[PDB]
Design a protein around this ligand. Structure first.
Ligand SMILES: CCCCCCCCCCCCCCCCCC(=O)OC[C@H](COP(=O)([O-])OCC(O)COP(=O)([O-])OC[C@@H](COC(=O)CCCCCCCCCCCCCCCCC)OC(=O)CCCCCCCCCCCCCCCCC)OC(=O)CCCCCCCCCCCCCCCCC
Ligand SMILES: CCCCCCCCCCCCCCCCCC(=O)OC[C@H](COP(=O)([O-])OCC(O)COP(=O)([O-])OC[C@@H](COC(=O)CCCCCCCCCCCCCCCCC)OC(=O)CCCCCCCCCCCCCCCCC)OC(=O)CCCCCCCCCCCCCCCCC
Ligand SMILES: CCCCCCCCCCCCCCCCCC(=O)OC[C@H](COP(=O)([O-])OCC(O)COP(=O)([O-])OC[C@@H](COC(=O)CCCCCCCCCCCCCCCCC)OC(=O)CCCCCCCCCCCCCCCCC)OC(=O)CCCCCCCCCCCCCCCCC
Ligand SMILES: CCCCCCCCCCCCCCCCCC(=O)OC[C@H](COP(=O)([O-])OCC(O)COP(=O)([O-])OC[C@@H](COC(=O)CCCCCCCCCCCCCCCCC)OC(=O)CCCCCCCCCCCCCCCCC)OC(=O)CCCCCCCCCCCCCCCCC
Ligand SMILES: CCCCCCCCCCCCCCCCCC(=O)OC[C@H](COP(=O)([O-])OCC(O)COP(=O)([O-])OC[C@@H](COC(=O)CCCCCCCCCCCCCCCCC)OC(=O)CCCCCCCCCCCCCCCCC)OC(=O)CCCCCCCCCCCCCCCCC
Ligand SMILES: CCCCCCCC/C=C/CCCCCCCC(=O)OC[C@H](COP(=O)(O)OCCN)OC(=O)CCCCCCC/C=C/CCCCCCCC
Ligand SMILES: CCCCCCCC/C=C\CCCCCCCC(=O)OC[C@H](COP(=O)(O)OCCN)OC(=O)CCCCCCC/C=C/CCCCCCCC
Ligand SMILES: [Zn+2]
Lengths: 230, 186, 226, 93, 73, 141, 122, 152, 100, 49
């Protein structure tokens, strides 16, 4: 027989990661922060390596445990956006009569909605192929093109906007809510860059996580679009 | 230090006597180059699929999970008795060998960076390309705008080519290089 | 069981590359001296040699037929040991529910060691009480202080070892007549002729008996690039 | 060979048509000095030599180029500034 | 989940494609495809945009035309 | 379905609480001995009596759940199952079609009208002298 | 029935097509299968994130009793000397970090004029 | 022109120049278009799954050009954004407690300019250049550079 | 295959919630008697009268609001020094002739 | 009734003895099933046979 769980006795990434966090506080140059971020990325990858190596234990509950962890993380991301919506709507009584130019409801909203919908369709096709034990090379490069356009559009919008964060709480909330969504789009790039075909298929937690996360980002933008643009 | 470090090899005889295993490559047993084999067959070099040659070097990974199984003894190259038993390992590889071991321990991190940098370079190019250009005329005088509201506010939709040329001339006047540039006619 | 993961490819069959190359010694090794891989191929080579000889099957007794395929004839001792093994394995990830324990029929608590923690929850319905945990050690008839339910520890122990499927086989299975390599050759020629190999394990096995790389195409079969 | 679930439709073994001598690993057996891997030919381990060599070269080029820019070129806000951030030619300051 | 039969009642096979001969009209083919893959996805997908579009474009009459003709001052 | 559930959508291990309906009850049946008739007093307990593999039905359930994992061909599900598996995918695709062919045309029409008349076609025209497009979603005014 | 090479002959029309059409059909088929898919095959095989996770891990023995390193050794050190070397390298940075961290405290302490506590009132 | 085919056949042929329609109507053509490793699993697919996958795939790819057209128009719109009236500094507008330095804690470039206030930075970079300190950007006319989306 | 939520849960609880919100709001308006006619205009009576005068032609077209008030702030005094409504109207008239 | 009807393990056969789905990048071979059904015969038809 064997123990139900193969215990993990020792770990040293925790110390390294925690020290990396402290380096952000104790920096005397923003250049150190940039290089420190690479270290954090490296060590987080090692932690992800340990999760993949745990497959050797053949434990049925490992998939379930990680899936429910992601559910909790998703909830935290939703509640973080709720706080920004809370901040935005608290000062609702002070909006729409101040001498600032709010965003148009015709151009930005439509193309972004169309663009992000295509992103969902690409990920949906990836899920379908994952169900069918099949792969299509071009799909990943469609995501990169999709992400390239999103970055190009958002950069221009910020640069050409004629109002600034210090003009009103409305502008601050607009910029902040849009940035928060962008950061979650960038986190999606971090995840999707490693998409590959793995032959153990439906016992791979990465596929279900990516599908859930991409759907969350897109639905959040619908709420943002209704609140700010429409 | 040890013989293995001096003469690195993959899966030769007398591994225990040589003192160390310097290769992370695991598996083999393919009848042809790039064919079906055993083990995962991953390494820094000589694996996967050559883009330059358009040929497969090793087969798809054969995981020890449900989808695969163990590797026959004929083709096992990382003997755990030599792979582990790390007592005295730093003397068997020396300082330089210690440096190589540290670099090779981060193959997982290296693979991610290769797949992660290029899109960031694309995003960075957008910023660099735009930063070179002079900024667009974001705002103008409050009163002058309203005295010609229709032309300025609706000019773009009615005729974007003439409107674009008009913007260029204003930028030339604003930054004082109108006489130095020839704006094409529209 | 529900707590096991997906069947691996090896759970069905092993690759021929795992066949021991010294087949002549493999077929002469006693069962107690054969490892997991050696035992697997001994049974498969000997089992398929008898099954691929149709003309001899009808005259072969079930005892001999079971021996050739490596199947163990069941008896009360072996059945008892195997049954308690499966019960132990099932309880690893399943609930422990059964009839109320009494002196005549104590609750059986399988264990490998000398001790295992148990809880008593009383009887059914109103007789059910709060969990009362106790350490069930070997050699004592335990009596719950609340409901008077009787528990007993059953140890899966045998001669300095704990019961396992292989241990049961070695203890009770008896090696029969030594396998004759002539049968391997005779069946090999029956199903393998003129480049057609419908009996491939025997083809490899016969090649190993003749050394290695003697039969047609075996040199190319054993040559690998990595 | 690969998985046991992939097989030819017609099970046929080619009758050797060439006279090529058998490779040593094709006839090798397990030996006390080689308990594992006797079926696979020995190969050079390039990763042990190339990885540290390539890493050193990239670091040297990376650091050397960074040092050269900050020394040969005039002071500037960023590397791109020091290369293209100067005033137009003929603009006296 | 309530077990229930498959509601598709159209043709199950058109036959081998032979340069597009002996095949139904295009509109009938579109109807068959949606029957095969389910109308529930069509209605669900289009429901949101139809509701939003009708509400916005209804204002052309409800908000613009009626208001001009109905202002007591 | 996307999400994994131990009870119903258990694709990680493929465990099923009951056998297929194809098998005759004699061959295999669901593990239910709730209807067992009272045991005669003269019968004696030989086995543990503990719920587990000693019961024939549970043993066959465990055996089948392991041996079903290799099958010669696919067990084709009906179109209802296949529809449900990609319900979200199909609906998102139709949502994209609706955006292109329904939202796009009238949004383009509104902007063109706005160009000529200073306000969207679904808005009351102002008489207060303020300039600009004004609101878009009229019913939220 | 004549079987053409896959992707080279259309089934939509009895006419194979004109020279330009045939060139486009044949060459797209070649570009996809033998030129564009090089990139995909290269990324899938030579740069697999999951393969890189098992790099340096011992082969899995078919004999079940020869894999005891799975539970005898913690997963963080399945890589032998590589995993230990990576751990040892970060250990060397402990004291360099302390000096670096101590400098930051000095920097803040100085910038707040806390060293002039006695000189201020002398 | 070719009279060996109907008009419908000709239209279908050209829409099939990349083989999309042929793969849709032939299972054999579809599976052979897969790479060998994945063709191994093709036998298990039902026709409902195969054609449904293509439908989702074709709708996505066919819609990508439309999104590209929208994005290009968006880039052109931003490339020639009309100027807007200068904001009157109202009661609660442009309030500052400290300079903007979070981007450059040590260098403190353009402390008075906001993080993405390009025109303010341009004039600030000009001062630094006039002080013999190089800075990158804002020097090339927009119509003389590539990818500006501002050309006539 | 076992279901946890309503078979049409997403559409049911989105459109259903919107319907209930809309119907509740109408009920609330009826109870309090709130006027439901929509006005998109500012209600400053004096300003609306001036706008009507411009529409009638009593006040020349394109005349700024600060040109019509009895108190001007400093910024408006700056603009009044450069204001020429007559010139603006002539320029617009010239544009119309060129267009036609 | 598990995994959408896809078995975890199944047999695949190839007509060419020297065929390797990982080494070759050809586009003519059609894999067969355990019963020998070619892959371009869909399962809803082959399962009825
Ligand atoms: C006489 C010739 C007439 C030609 C007319 C023009 C036709 C152009 C079609 C372009 C379609 C691009 C669609 C992009 C989305 C991704 C597609 C995809 O999934 O590809 C998978 C495909 C194969 O992927 P895989 O993973 O191997 O296989 C996956 C599947 O299993 C198997 O995949 P699959 O085989 O099912 O793929 C189906 C299909 C799925 O996608 C579609 O079917 C979408 C179709 C959309 C149509 C868009 C037309 C745009 C035209 C606009 C023109 C505007 C003019 C304005 C004028 C203004 C005047 C004032 O994908 C493709 O076929 C993609 C195109 C393949 C070409 C690759 C070679 C390089 C480009 C060659 C271009 C040649 C143009 C010649 C023009 C001559 C004119 C006389 O990917 C590749 O081949 C690799 C990447 C390259 C693909 C994209 C190439 C873009 C080329 C654009 C050309 C048009 C430019 C117009 C500019 C106008 C400026 C004003
Ligand atoms: C035709 C073909 C042509 C081909 C041409 C090819 C040309 C190739 C050229 C290659 C060379 C490039 C050189 C430049 C590279 C960039 C360097 C740089 O400046 O980066 C930072 C740069 C900003 O820096 P900067 O302002 O330029 O430099 C200011 C100076 O640092 C001013 O100094 P500061 O004092 O203000 O700085 C504060 C100081 C703060 O210093 C301190 O606090 C320490 C001071 C005392 C230390 C004394 C020792 C005591 C012990 C210390 C212990 C420390 C550790 C303690 C524990 C942890 C906590 C600290 O910070 C530092 O020291 C900075 C470095 C710190 C170390 C970071 C790690 C670096 C490792 C790199 C190598 C890897 C490891 C090697 C291991 C070797 C083993 C054998 O930031 C960025 O790069 C931001 C943008 C992001 C990257 C963009 C990439 C764009 C790529 C464009 C590609 C174009 C492709 C075109 C294709 C076209 C196709 C047609
Ligand atoms: C007006 C126009 C504009 C509208 C804008 C709308 C904006 C919406 C924003 C939404 C953002 C995106 C979020 C979802 C992203 C993923 C989408 C996705 O993949 O969907 C397809 C996919 C469909 O799954 P499937 O298995 O294929 O289903 C097939 C069939 O649909 C049939 O499936 P089935 O029925 O057979 O059931 C299977 C499936 C069915 O489930 C689903 O499919 C879920 C679909 C959800 C879609 C989102 C709809 C909106 C939900 C609103 C919930 C509000 C909560 C209450 C807030 C109160 C505030 C005061 O089950 C699961 O997948 C289980 C998932 C785990 C659920 C964990 C829930 C934890 C929280 C429990 C409540 C806590 C409060 C207790 C209070 C009482 C205490 C006594 O969904 C998933 O698989 C997603 C599951 C993973 C993400 C779960 C996230 C849970 C977050 C919990 C937050 C709790 C906060 C509590 C405190 C709050 C107050 C302080
Ligand atoms: C004499 C005077 C005469 C006067 C005559 C006047 C005439 C007036 C006529 C008025 C007519 C009124 C009619 C009323 C009765 C309606 C009856 C009806 O059919 O109701 C039900 C009908 C449909 O409900 P249903 O029957 O439940 O739907 C059946 C489904 O198939 C259920 O099946 P299912 O549940 O399987 O459905 C599929 C489902 C299956 O679910 C799953 O597969 C499982 C997973 C579900 C959870 C998903 C989680 C998240 C997914 C992530 C992926 C996202 C992708 C997109 C990403 C975008 C990124 C930007 O999946 C989905 O549907 C969701 C996924 C698809 C994509 C979702 C996209 C985002 C949605 C959320 C945002 C929505 C707002 C967007 C706004 C725009 C953009 C910002 O409801 C409506 O249509 C709503 C009623 C609207 C009433 C409007 C009334 C006002 C307007 C009046 C206009 C006319 C006035 C003209 C003037 C007249 C003056 C006199
Ligand atoms: C912003 C403005 C608007 C922009 C819109 C942009 C739209 C982009 C759409 C792109 C669609 C791509 C379609 C590809 C079709 C491929 C078939 C084809 O044509 O193959 C022919 C042929 C095939 O030969 P083959 O295969 O050997 O056949 C021999 C067989 O024996 C015989 O076999 P066969 O008979 O089957 O082969 C021949 C057959 C082949 O074709 C077919 O039968 C077609 C069947 C499939 C059709 C499926 C649909 C295709 C997509 C339709 C897209 C519609 C776009 C609508 C846009 C509206 C915009 C308002 O028939 C044809 O060749 C007929 C071609 C019809 C072309 C129609 C062109 C319409 C242009 C409209 C312009 C409007 C401008 C308005 C300006 C307003 C200003 C206020 O080879 C080529 O494709 C030739 C390529 C070389 C062309 C050279 C062109 C030189 C142009 C010089 C211009 C100089 C300008 C100077 C200016 C100076 C100023 C001062
Ligand atoms: C015997 C009876 C026959 C009757 C025949 C009736 C035929 C009716 C044909 C109606 C055609 C209507 C076409 C409308 C197209 C409008 C396209 C348009 O506006 O494109 C722009 C817009 C994007 O522009 P942006 O600048 O980005 O602005 C919006 C976002 N910012 O793009 C789109 O709208 C793309 C979507 C195209 C929609 C096409 C609609 C086609 C409708 C055809 C109906 C045919 C009916 C036939 C009935 C037959 C009865 C026997
Ligand atoms: C190889 C190089 C690759 C580079 C490109 C690819 C990688 C890109 C990575 C993701 C980048 C995401 C950037 C997110 C921050 C964006 C900042 C931004 O835009 O801020 C401005 C925007 C609007 O401002 P205005 O200029 O007034 O707008 C007027 C419009 N004309 O919003 C703000 O001002 C808010 C700024 C919030 C910034 C938050 C980012 C985190 C910064 C943390 C600094 C901490 C320093 C202290 C020490 C601790 C170090 C950890
Ligand atoms: Zn008790």
């Amino acid at each position: 027989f064997e123990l139900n769980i193969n215990i993990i006795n020792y770990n040293y990434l925790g110390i390294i990661i925690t020290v990396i966090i402290s380096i952000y506080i104790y920096n005397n140059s923003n250049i150190i922060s940039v290089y420190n971020s690479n270290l954090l990325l490296i060590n987080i990858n090692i932690w992800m390596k340990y999760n993949i190596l745990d497959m050797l234990n053949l434990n049925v509950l490992d998939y379930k445990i990680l899936l429910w962890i992601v559910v909790i993380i998703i909830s935290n991301e939703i509640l973080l956006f709720v706080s920004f919506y809370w901040i935005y709507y608290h000062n609702y009584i002070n909006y729409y009569h101040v001498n600032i130019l709010i965003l148009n409801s015709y151009n930005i909203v439509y193309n972004n909605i169309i663009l992000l919908t295509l992103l969902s369709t690409i990920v949906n096709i990836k899920f379908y192929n994952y169900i069918l034990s099949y792969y299509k090379y071009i799909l990943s490069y469609l995501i990169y093109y999709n992400n390239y356009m999103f970055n190009n559009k958002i950069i221009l919008e910020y640069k050409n906007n004629s109002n600034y964060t210090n003009d009103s709480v409305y502008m601050t909330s607009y910029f902040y809510i849009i940035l928060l969504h962008y950061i979650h789009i960038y986190d999606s790039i971090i995840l999707i860059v490693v998409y590959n075909y793995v032959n153990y298929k439906n016992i791979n937690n990465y596929y279900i996580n990516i599908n859930i996360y991409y759907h969350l980002i897109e639905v959040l933008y619908i709420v943002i679009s209704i609140l700010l643009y429409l | 230090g040890c013989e293995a470090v001096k003469n690195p090899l993959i899966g030769g005889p007398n591994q225990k006597a040589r003192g160390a295993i310097t290769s992370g490559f695991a598996g083999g047993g393919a009848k042809r180059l790039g064919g079906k084999g055993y083990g995962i067959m991953a390494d820094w070099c000589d694996h996967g699929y050559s883009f330059t040659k358009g040929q497969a070097i090793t087969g798809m990974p054969h995981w020890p999970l449900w989808c695969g199984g163990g590797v026959p003894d004929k083709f096992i190259k990382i003997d755990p008795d030599v792979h582990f038993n790390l007592q005295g390992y730093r003397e068997r590889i020396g300082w330089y060998g210690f440096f190589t071991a540290f670099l090779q321990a981060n193959y997982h991190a290296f693979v991610y960076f290769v797949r992660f940098i290029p899109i960031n370079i694309a995003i960075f190019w957008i910023y660099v390309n735009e930063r070179q250009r002079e900024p667009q005329e974001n705002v103008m005088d409050h009163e002058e705008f309203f005295r010609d509201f229709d032309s300025i506010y609706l000019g773009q939709v009615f005729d974007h080519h003439r409107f674009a040329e008009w913007l260029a001339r204003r930028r030339a006047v604003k930054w004082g290089y109108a006489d130095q540039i020839h704006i094409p006619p529209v | 069981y529900r707590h096991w993961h997906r069947m691996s490819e090896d759970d069905w069959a092993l690759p021929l590359d795992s066949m021991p190359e010294d087949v002549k010694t493999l077929m002469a090794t006693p069962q107690t001296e054969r490892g997991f891989v050696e035992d697997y191929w001994y049974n498969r080579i000997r089992g398929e040699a008898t099954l691929l000889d149709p003309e001899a099957l009808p005259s072969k007794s079930y005892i001999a037929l079971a021996r050739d395929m490596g199947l163990q004839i069941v008896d009360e001792p072996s059945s008892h040991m195997m049954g308690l093994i499966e019960l132990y394995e099932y309880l690893r990830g399943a609930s422990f529910v059964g009839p109320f324990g009494t002196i005549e029929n104590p609750v059986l608590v399988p264990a490998v060691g000398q001790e295992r923690v148990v809880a008593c929850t009383g009887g059914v319905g109103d007789e059910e009480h709060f969990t009362l945990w106790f350490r069930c050690r070997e050699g004592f008839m335990y009596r719950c202080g609340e409901c008077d339910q009787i528990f007993m520890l059953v140890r899966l122990y045998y001669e300095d070892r704990y019961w396992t499927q292989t241990l049961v086989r070695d203890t009770f299975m008896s090696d029969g007549d030594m396998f004759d390599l002539k049968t391997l050759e005779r069946v090999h020629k029956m199903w393998n002729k003129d480049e057609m190999v419908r009996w491939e394990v025997g083809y490899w096995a016969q090649d190993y008996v003749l050394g290695k790389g003697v039969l047609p195409g075996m040199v190319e079969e054993h040559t690998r690039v990595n | 060979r690969g998985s046991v679930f992939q097989m030819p439709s017609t099970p046929v073994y080619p009758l050797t048509t060439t006279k090529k001598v058998a490779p040593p690993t094709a006839l090798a057996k397990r030996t006390p000095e080689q308990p594992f891997g006797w079926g696979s030919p020995v190969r050079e381990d390039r990763a042990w030599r190339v990885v540290p060599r390539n890493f050193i070269i990239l670091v040297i080029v990376y650091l050397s180029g960074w040092a050269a820019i900050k020394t040969m070129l005039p002071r500037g806000g960023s590397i791109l500034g020091q290369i293209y951030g100067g005033p137009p030619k003929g603009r006296l300051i | 989940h309530i077990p229930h039969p498959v509601k598709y009642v159209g043709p199950r096979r058109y036959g081998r494609y032979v340069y597009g001969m002996n095949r139904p009209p295009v509109l009938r083919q579109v109807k068959d495809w949606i029957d095969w893959t389910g109308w529930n996805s069509v209605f669900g997908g289009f429901s949101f945009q139809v509701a939003f579009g009708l509400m916005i474009v209804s204002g052309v009459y409800l908000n613009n035309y009626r208001a001009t003709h109905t202002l007591y001052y | 379905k996307h999400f994994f559930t131990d009870g119903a959508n258990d694709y990680v291990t493929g465990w099923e609480n009951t056998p297929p309906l194809k098998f005759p009850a004699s061959v295999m049946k669901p593990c239910d001995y709730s209807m067992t008739k009272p045991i005669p007093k003269h019968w004696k307990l030989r086995g543990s009596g503990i719920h587990g593999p000693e019961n024939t039905d549970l043993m066959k359930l465990v055996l089948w759940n392991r041996l079903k994992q290799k099958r010669p061909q696919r067990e084709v599900p009906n179109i209802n199952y296949l529809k449900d598996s990609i319900r979200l995918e199909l609906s998102v695709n139709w949502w994209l079609m609706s955006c292109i062919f329904l939202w796009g045309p009238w949004l383009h029409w509104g902007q063109e009208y706005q160009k000529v008349h200073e306000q969207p076609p679904w808005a009351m025209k102002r008489i207060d002298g303020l300039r600009g497009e004004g609101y878009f979603t009229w019913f939220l005014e | 029935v004549t079987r053409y090479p896959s992707g080279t002959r259309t089934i939509m029309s009895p006419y194979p097509g004109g020279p330009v059409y045939q060139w486009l059909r044949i060459n797209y088929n070649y570009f996809k299968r033998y030129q564009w898919r090089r990139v995909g095959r290269w990324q899938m095989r030579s740069w697999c994130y999951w393969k890189a996770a098992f790099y340096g891990v011992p082969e899995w023995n078919i004999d079940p009793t020869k894999n005891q390193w799975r539970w005898c050794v913690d997963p963080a050190w399945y890589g032998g000397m590589r995993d230990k070397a990576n751990m040892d390298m970060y250990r060397l940075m402990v004291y360099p970090f302390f000096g670096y961290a101590l400098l930051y405290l000095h920097s803040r302490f100085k910038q707040n004029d806390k060293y002039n506590v006695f000189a201020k009132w002398r | 022109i070719s009279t060996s085919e109907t008009l419908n056949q000709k239209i279908l042929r050209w829409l099939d120049v990349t083989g999309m329609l042929t793969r849709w109507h032939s299972r054999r053509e579809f599976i052979l278009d897969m790479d060998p490793y994945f063709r191994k699993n093709s036998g298990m697919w039902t026709e409902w799954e195969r054609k449904t996958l293509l439908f989702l795939f074709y709708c996505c790819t066919l819609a990508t050009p439309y999104s590209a057209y929208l994005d290009l128009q968006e880039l052109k719109h931003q490339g020639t954004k009309p100027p807007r009236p200068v904001s009157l500094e109202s009661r609660f507008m442009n309030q500052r407690r400290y300079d903007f330095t979070w981007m450059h804690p040590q260098d403190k470039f353009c402390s008075e300019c906001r993080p993405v206030e390009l025109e303010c930075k341009k004039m600030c970079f000009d001062r630094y250049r006039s002080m013999d300190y190089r800075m990158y950007g804002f020097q090339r006319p927009r119509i003389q550079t590539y990818y500006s989306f501002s050309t006539c | 295959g076992r279901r946890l939520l309503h078979g049409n849960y997403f559409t049911r609880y989105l459109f259903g919630s919107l319907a209930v919100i809309w119907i509740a709001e109408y009920a609330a308006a009826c109870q309090y008697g709130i006027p439901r006619h929509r006005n998109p205009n500012w209600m400053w009576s004096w300003w609306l009268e001036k706008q009507n005068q411009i529409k009638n032609g009593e006040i020349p077209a394109n005349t700024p609001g600060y040109a019509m008030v009895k108190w001007n702030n400093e910024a408006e005094q700056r603009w009044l020094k450069t204001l020429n409504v007559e010139a603006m109207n002539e320029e617009f008239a010239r544009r119309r002739e060129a267009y036609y | 009734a598990y995994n959408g009807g896809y078995p975890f393990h199944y047999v695949v056969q190839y007509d060419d003895p020297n065929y390797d789905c990982e080494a070759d990048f050809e586009f003519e071979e059609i894999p067969r099933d355990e019963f020998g059904v070619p892959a371009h015969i869909p399962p809803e038809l082959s399962t009825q046979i």
